[PDB]
Amino acid sequence: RPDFCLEPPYAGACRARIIRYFYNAKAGLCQTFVYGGCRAKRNNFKSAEDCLRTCGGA
């Protein structure tokens, strides 16, 4: 699995409330989180499908 998928979700410092997905590697699930709109890291997807396609293979 890609290393960036193992990183914790990153809201960042900005003040928007944008629902995004991250791969939760303990759960083995893509989950939602609130992204603030700046400085996104890579474990931050616009859909569950994109998250799972990227992060959701061994």
Curated annotation (Swiss-Prot):
This is Pancreatic trypsin inhibitor. The record marks R15, A16 as: Reactive bond for trypsin. The chain holds residues 36 to 93 of 100 of the full protein. One of its GO terms (cellular component) is serine protease inhibitor complex. Its main location: secreted. The keyword Zinc does not apply. The keyword Disulfide bond applies. Disulfide bonds join C5-C55, C14-C38, C30-C51. It is found in: Secreted. It comes from the Eukaryota. Inhibits trypsin, kallikrein, chymotrypsin, and plasmin. The lineage of its organism: Eukaryota, Metazoa, Chordata, Craniata, Vertebrata. It comes from Bos taurus (Bovine). One of its GO terms (molecular function) is sulfate binding. Residues 5-55 form the BPTI/Kunitz inhibitor domain. Keywords: Disulfide bond, Pharmaceutical, Protease inhibitor, Secreted, Serine protease inhibitor, Signal. GO terms for biological process: negative regulation of platelet aggregation; negative regulation of serine-type endopeptidase activity; negative regulation of thrombin-activated receptor signaling pathway; trypsinogen activation.
